[PDB]
């Protein structure tokens, strides 16, 4: 298995959403991941795994699980706190068979506290820490940024960081430990730039009136003639200049870039400009420039974009496309992910692992 | 320095946005981070660092930088590809003095390909790979989800994974290597669940019409009597049921949960319900159940929410709050972050590095 984590052994206890994403990226990077499910998946997410089944509530399944865990470097669970405890797969039971184990707990609310037993989803976790409030336009109610901020950016990615960090630690203490990965905490650190900016006046709690939330005419999308969109990210003065130059707008006749009072005016002039031609016309105009103007591609157009083609950001599977592994490593490169295969036998895996 | 990365040594070449966030998280977990800037910061982001100064264009600063790197585990750089190269700090130069270095390159577009020398910001990277199109309501142009998805979720957090993965690979090879972390690749993997779902009919390219983008009346925010919001995440039938009960709605009077054809009706009835009382009324109704209904708090309210208080998700600083370290480690815990203190002389750090 190619990648920098070639050699690492991960048990994943089948759950939903953030946990399997973390397991995926470990497999993507060469880890040997073995997912235990309840008694062929067409879910690309379950790439780079072997799947086995066990009934964790039977003595026999309990015992099989504990033997896999005994040979593994990592365990990923995403159940309510107290669930593995009650199954006999809690941290203390695991430690008795494998004190080198990195026991990784993926939750929304974390291991303890008033909401720790309560159900929730991404939207709930980012609702509670200021993130969801800060998304969207001032004249509309907060829109969920899918589940990219709670589940993934501030969920699985923090689990991953904790897992790999605790592996580095183990390299000098010889022991593992428990990683408590709560989406409510991970997403907060994810948005630390904004908490920093609050204290210096570089960000306000008012919706849709900041530099990065759609409040700024140079940091937004614009609708073009064909009803399709471009994205403008032209923050530096020299990027802004380049963007006005492509539009054929005379800076002398426009409000200054950072005269907020005149941002309505600026936006309206930018709107009328971008609306005068189709999306793809602006890709030609701004070609090779620092204007920070890009087409906004729908998923089904992505695989035709040259920079995406040239770098192999996606690979073909099933319906269509899935993202290749990230990030990239110069010497131990990942290979194209392996599909979900049929189930396999658990004793088989033990015997492979010895 | 407390945490699992105690002992790790990181040189950070000063730049913007994703790279400093990666350096932060390493510092938060115990690393020894030393940021080289140009000739006290009040940027909470620069917490858990020592700042040194050098002119890398000058024989003397290049040589001082090279001596630091010589002693480090990890280098972070966020410039245009080709910049360290021409400065004398390219991967091949660093390898000459330290072949165990993890050389970690944080870009938007990546090291090679047609856009790799073009300026860009978060909004641009996620414009190109389908993510930004997928954000927001069907009747509004795509709204940026701040810079959570490209700069951090798919940016710094992948740089981190790459760094720590490479450190693991280095334990058996005895060598480092280069990590090419491009926001356009990391964000794609971040959104892999959607690319999975496209192939199984569980996600459409149509904006504002999916389970997680605000298309579903049970996964969205609603305006309350006071003009504030709640978030509803009630996907599972039993969660939905609890939500209807807290609203005092009779299930039999409503359309089925997943009759999409009557989702306008279902939304209107939910709209009317939530509008009848103020956010904090619903925050109380829904405080304990599995209804998946949470108040949408603004940042300035967060620190008063019981669950946030009890788990110490934030700490005081510079007249505001900042997020504590994430994730959490049961044995080598992180401490409260150290502020950005004054500069330090670079020879003094070299000395300290035995």
Numbering used by the authors:
A (entry chain B), B (entry chain A): 1 to 39, 45 to 359
Question: What does the paper behind this entry write?
Answer:
Crystals of the three MCR mutants H126A, D156A and E241A were obtained using identical conditions to those used with the wild-type enzyme and diffracted to 2.45, 1.64 and 1.85 Å resolutions, respectively. The overall structures for these single mutants were very similar to those of the wild-type structure, with small root-mean-squared deviation (RMSD) differences of 0.38, 0.37 and 0.38 Å for 693 Cα atoms of the H126A, D156A and E241A mutant structures being observed, respectively. The three mutants collectively had fewer hydrogen bond interactions; within the H126A, D156A and E241A mutants, 3, 5 and 5 interactions were observed, respectively. The active site of the E241A mutant stands out, as the relative positions of the active-site residues D156 and H126 are identical to the wild-type. These two active-site residues remain parallel to each other, and part of the PEG molecule is nestled in between them; consequently, most of the associated hydrogen bond interactions are retained. Within this mutant, the H126 residue is hydrogen-bonded to the peptide nitrogen atom of A241 through a water molecule, and due to this interaction, the movement of H126 gets restricted and it does not pivot away like E241 within the H126A mutant. This important structural water molecule within the E241A mutant active site resides where the functional group of the E241 side-chain was. However, the introduction of this structural water molecule does not replace all the hydrogen bonds lost in the active site. The rate-against-amount of enzyme plots show the expected enzyme-dependent increase in rate, while the specific activities calculated for wild-type, H126A, D156A and E241A were 46.4, 3.2, 18.5 and 12.2 µmol.min−1.mg−1. No significant change outside the enzymatic active site was observed in the three mutants, establishing that the diminution of catalytic activity is mainly attributable to disruption of the catalytic apparatus involving key hydrogen bonding and water-mediated interactions.
